[PDB]
């Protein structure tokens, strides 16, 4: 219906839980490392720590539920506004051909946790295909995030 004060929080609580594989309220280098290793990549022990050290505003070395609600608000400034969309795209376009297919999306799905069924995944891409090409392109992935 309409993004309310709870619908939003629930969304972040899910992402904060996806990383907390165990669910102790603290993302470690191994946990986030497992997620970065499942999507189909290989995080570096040094970069990883430096990555979890960015949101870690406390200086402890672990991310927390509150640090989350406060991390998505510190990147929407300028050093990560239009570059974050191109990254999310890469995840979908693993092959990097210039388009996304329900298959590439199905892969990312199980890589984060939920795995949308088929008809849904098929319709999810059909609604974005403003041109009707059977797949999603870069313009769409952006035209949907630029028009508010």
């Amino acid at each position: 219906a309409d993004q309310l004060t709870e619908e939003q929080i629930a969304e972040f609580k899910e992402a904060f839980s996806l990383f907390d594989k165990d669910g102790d309220g603290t993302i470690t280098t191994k946990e986030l490392g497992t997620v970065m290793r499942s999507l189909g990549q290989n995080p570096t022990e040094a970069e990883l720590q430096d990555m979890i050290n960015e949101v870690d505003a406390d200086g402890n070395g672990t991310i927390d539920f509150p640090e989350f609600l406060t991390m998505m608000a510190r990147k929407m400034k300028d050093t990560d506004s239009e570059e974050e969309i191109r990254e999310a795209f890469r995840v979908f376009d693993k092959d990097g051909n210039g388009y996304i297919s329900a298959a590439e999306l199905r892969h990312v799905m199980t890589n984060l946790g939920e795995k949308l069924t088929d008809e849904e995944v098929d319709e999810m891409i059909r609604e974005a295909d403003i041109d009707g090409d059977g797949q999603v392109n870069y313009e769409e992935f952006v035209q949907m995030m630029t028009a508010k």
Binding site: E14, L39, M71, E87, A88, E123, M124, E127, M144, M145
Partner: peptide, 26 residues
Amino acid sequence: VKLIPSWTTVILVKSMLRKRSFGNPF
């Protein structure tokens, strides 16, 4: 060249995994 997906990034693709729609309000 790139340098691994940043933080808000991994949250971008996961947030996309909502239900059957596309695009994030953020």
